[PDB]
């Protein structure tokens, strides 16, 4: 609690102060964004200083050959007139704000932001080499600028922009153990091909291995030629319309075979990590402050409720286990006999004690 973050407008006329850059979304309460803006009247000439917080979607246009160019469509914008203080307004300060003005004097004006819940968390989509601009995805930013009114074009030199992140961590109590089973019956037998699978637990941390217990019971004429285990990142995206992708981030293709009238049990262990997923442009990642590496995006935790089609990028994970079943049969290979099941789980960082850094050990 001894250090605070600071950033100055280019002409030094504005100076934003914050206690932190990550603000935690415990699903029912996301912690507020409180700071102060330090107005220097030796350079101030501008008659009003506002602070706005924005949550924005950032993308490049597909059909443009203009590298480094991005666009930033807004998702949530708050406005706060910080200078001068407008009466018909008496709010108390935070202890953070209180200590800051004791440190800086009455030239530091507070600003307090409340993030409404059901807003997207900071998520960055993996750039390819053809990406040289700002990181695409959903980013948060507090802006402080001085202008006459909110209509007036504001000047870059008279403003200061500060990226922050809305983030979540693992819940305390793990869910029920992930379990799944399916039973596939073909045309002329009624004796089944049964697939059962399970994960050893419901909550994993980044870098942590995942063990899937597979148990298959073939009571059919068919033989499974391979088993494919894969961890998939599901991303639900919604800006003007909805988009979905399902991207394997770790995968094992075993040549295990399950003969007719057989059983089979094997455990498989996969470990999602970024190093073998660098080619997958658009893969979702945890929010980038500027350009440093971040992990595979943590699962988004939602408040259980009607599907409000939340704007932003909603990330989830499931293990998939597919059995690759021979195609003899009276139908040739015109149709698939494959059998698969999907096991959801939660992939997050644990609740920390110290805040997360901007870079980790820079070079």
């Amino acid at each position, epitope marked *: 609690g001894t250090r605070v973050f600071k950033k100055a407008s280019p002409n030094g006329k504005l100076t934003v102060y914050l206690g932190k850059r990550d603000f935690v979304d415990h699903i029912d309460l996301v912690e507020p964004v409180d700071g102060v803006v330090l107005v220097d009247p030796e350079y101030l000439k501008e008659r009003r200083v506002y602070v706005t917080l924005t949550c924005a979607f950032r993308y490049g246009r597909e059909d443009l050959d203009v590298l480094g160019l991005t666009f930033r469509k807004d998702l949530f914008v708050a406005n706060v007139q910080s200078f001068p203080p407008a009466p018909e307004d008496k709010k108390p300060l935070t202890r953070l704000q209180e200590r800051l003005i004791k440190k800086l004097g009455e030239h530091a004006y507070p600003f307090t932001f409340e993030i409404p819940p059901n807003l997207p968390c900071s998520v960055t989509l993996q750039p390819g080499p053809e990406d040289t601009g700002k990181a695409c995805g959903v980013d948060y930013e507090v802006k402080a600028f001085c202008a006459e009114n909110l209509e007036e074009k504001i000047h870059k030199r008279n403003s200061v922009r500060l990226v922050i992140r809305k983030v979540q961590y693992a819940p305390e109590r793990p869910g029920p153990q992930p379990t799944a089973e399916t039973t596939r019956q073909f045309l002329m037998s009624d004796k089944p091909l049964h697939l059962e699978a399970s994960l050893d637990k419901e909550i994993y941390y980044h870098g942590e291995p995942i063990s899937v217990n597979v148990h298959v019971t073939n009571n059919t004429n068919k033989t499974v030629k391979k088993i494919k285990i894969s961890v998939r990142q599901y991303a639900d995206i919604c800006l003007f319309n909805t988009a979905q992708y399902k991207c394997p981030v770790a995968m094992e293709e075993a040549d295990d075979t399950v003969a007719p009238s057989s059983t089979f049990c094997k455990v498989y262990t996969l470990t999602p990590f970024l190093a073998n997923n660098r080619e997958k442009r658009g893969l979702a990642l945890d929010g980038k402050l500027k350009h440093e590496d971040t992990n595979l995006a943590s699962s988004t935790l939602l408040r259980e409720g009607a599907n409000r089609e939340i704007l932003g990028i909603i990330v989830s994970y499931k293990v998939k286990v597919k059995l690759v079943v021979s195609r003899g049969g009276l139908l040739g290979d015109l149709a698939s006999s494959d059998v698969a099941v999907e096991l959801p789980f939660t992939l997050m960082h644990p609740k920390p004690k110290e805040e997360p850094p901007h870079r980790e*050990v820079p070079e």
Partner: antibody
Amino acid sequence: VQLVESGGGLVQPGGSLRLSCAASGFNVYSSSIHWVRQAPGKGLEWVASISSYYGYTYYADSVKGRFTISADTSKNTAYLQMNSLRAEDTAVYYCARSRQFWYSGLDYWGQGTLVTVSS
Amino acid sequence: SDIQMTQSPSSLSASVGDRVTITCRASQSVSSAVAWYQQKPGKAPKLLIYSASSLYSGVPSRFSGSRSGTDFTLTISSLQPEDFATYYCQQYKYVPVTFGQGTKVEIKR
């Protein structure tokens, strides 16, 4: 949990050696791994780091071109290949574990293995 | 342009139960990415304090760190027999991480 190092001995100047550090009891994709060198009675020198999750390796400027850090994540072990060995590079070489998310000091060290370089 | 972490004093003598302060200065700001390590001779270094003031899980509460800009201090409140060793600071804000020279903490007899 254990970092147990191997492969330390005596070798002539300009020769080569490989150190092995069998981790045990944690997850190599959630821990980055380091080599720290203690000249007898002279303190601590970082020599190299590897991070498997992200695929990156880092080297002490004094050691580029001669040392290569690498990991075999199935066998759960890391390796330091040491080429063109000066007498200076004599030291106790410690394997040391760190937390990938996020680096909070070297929280576990191996008991070390001794590297001697002389004619 | 490596970061030099000048620990002070080089060596100091004190007796059981006392308060002791070792200090470490940093060529430039390293934010709070400073660690503190105990090493008893012939043994592998052990971690005491990360993030410049955070006690490492398992360490006795008699160890504390703190920061004033580029100057970083470890202090033990009630010295004890278990605590006689050498002590290194470390900055880990920048590659390469760099340790201090050590401060020898002997018994006053």
